[PDB]
Amino acid sequence: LVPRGGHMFMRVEKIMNSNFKTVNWNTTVFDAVKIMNENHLYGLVVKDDNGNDVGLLSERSIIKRFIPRNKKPDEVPIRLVMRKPIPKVKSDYDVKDVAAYLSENGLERCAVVDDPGRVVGIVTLTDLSRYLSRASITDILLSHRTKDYQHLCPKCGVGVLEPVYNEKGEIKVFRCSNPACDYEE
Amino acid sequence: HMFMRVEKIMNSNFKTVNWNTTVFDAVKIMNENHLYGLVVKDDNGNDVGLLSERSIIKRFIPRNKKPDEVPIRLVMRKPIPKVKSDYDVKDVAAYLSENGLERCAVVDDPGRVVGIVTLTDLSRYLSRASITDILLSHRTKDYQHLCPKCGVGVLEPVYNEKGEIKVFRCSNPACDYEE
Ligand SMILES: [Fe+2]
Numbered sequence: 001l002v003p004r005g006g007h008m009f010m011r012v013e014k015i016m017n018s019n020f021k022t023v024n025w026n027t028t029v030f031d032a033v034k035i036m037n038e039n040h041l042y043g044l045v046v047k048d049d050n051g052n053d054v055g056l057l058s059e060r061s062i063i064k065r066f067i068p069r070n071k072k073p074d075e076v077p078i079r080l081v082m083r084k085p086i087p088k089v090k091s092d093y094d095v096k097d098v099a100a101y102l103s104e105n106g107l108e109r110c111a112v113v114d115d116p117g118r119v120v121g122i123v124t125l126t127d128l129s130r131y132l133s134r135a136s137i138t139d140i141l142l143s144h145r146t147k148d149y150q151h152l153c154p155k156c157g158v159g160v161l162e163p164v165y166n167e168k169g170e171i172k173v174f175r176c177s178n179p180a181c182d183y184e185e
Numbered sequence: 186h187m188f189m190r191v192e193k194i195m196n197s198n199f200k201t202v203n204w205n206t207t208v209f210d211a212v213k214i215m216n217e218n219h220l221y222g223l224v225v226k227d228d229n230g231n232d233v234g235l236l237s238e239r240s241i242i243k244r245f246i247p248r249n250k251k252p253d254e255v256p257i258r259l260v261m262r263k264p265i266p267k268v269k270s271d272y273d274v275k276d277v278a279a280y281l282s283e284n285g286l287e288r289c290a291v292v293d294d295p296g297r298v299v300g301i302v303t304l305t306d307l308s309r310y311l312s313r314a315s316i317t318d319i320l321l322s323h324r325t326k327d328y329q330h331l332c333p334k335c336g337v338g339v340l341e342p343v344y345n346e347k348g349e350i351k352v353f354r355c356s357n358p359a360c361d362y363e364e
């Protein structure tokens with residue numbers, strides 16, 4: 001953490017966490033959370049088996065998408081829980097622009113990618129709190145409580161994955177909203 | 186102003202759940218209400234704890250059990266994190282940061298929980314530095330679950346070969362409490 005002092009403007013790249021951790025998408029919720037608890041890191045980058053960055057696992061994603069399934073954490077691969085596609089902003093974004101992105105999506109952290117598209121870090125509300133106005137911080141906090149990230153289907157990439165519940169309120173599957181797509185997970 | 190008592194900004198319209206409610210049912214309540222902090226009461230009306238997202242990630246997931254098989258009494262922050270209603274927001278901030286919390290209960294003189302106060306509530310009256318402090322402490326520190334029997338030891342996780350929490354045991358050698 002490079003000390004920089006408060007400034008109205010600030011390039012995300014300069015304040016993001018370059019020492020982020022990446023986990024495989026088949027990692028269980030149990031094993032992923034062990035990593036979070038151990039490192040006191042509540043945001044992990046998720047890659048598929050070919051090295052593609054496919055999502056981001058956060059605390060809220062676990063509370064919103066894992067718990068409702070009502071299964072043991074060692075029985076659910078994080079691919080079914082992570083925010084996907086991976087939430088992200090460009091490394092040259094000002095903190096203000098990053099704030100707007102997080103708020104628009106109800107997030108409190110996202111990945112940062114460089115021009116060629118590589119994930120170079122993770123930026124959180126904590127990171128941003130040193131530069132954002134108090135009003136901007138409250139906005140992100142309120143948006144995170146009230147809004148949920150829109151997860152897109154990995155099969156057609158266009159449809160929105162919506163939850164399908166049963167009589168117990170359990171999430172049986174998340175189903176692609178795309179009429180032309182028949183995907184469920 | 187340089188002053189503002191928490192009672193004025195707290196949320197007096199909060200949700201309370203029984204301590205035998207499963208993590209599954211408690212989370213469904215939180216998800217449906219978009220309120221990620223519940224006050225927990227026992228079967229005798231006593232406020233015994235506060236269930237937060239972090240308490241679930243730290244004290245539920247590691248047990249590797251279905252959400253409907255674990256009662257929140259074993260997950261919630263306990264003893265209940267709290268501040269008096271006459272506390273200045275700066276004092277509430279110090280309390281949260283000292284405890285690695287982002288929210289806590291507010292009690293009146295008699296001692297009953299009258300509301301819940303969150304970082305979002307405080308964000309409108311705290312300095313930028315204090316807000317950052319609370320965020321840093323919530324990430325770096327975790328609430329200390331003081332032992333209810335000896336009152337001085339702290340309940341520590343006891344793991345099996347898989348790294349699963351079997352029980353939380355008091356750190357006090359002179360004490361034999363565990364849950
Ligand atoms: Fe689809």
Ligand SMILES: [Fe+2]
Pocket residue numbers: 332333334335336337338339355356357360361362
């Ligand atoms: Fe003890």
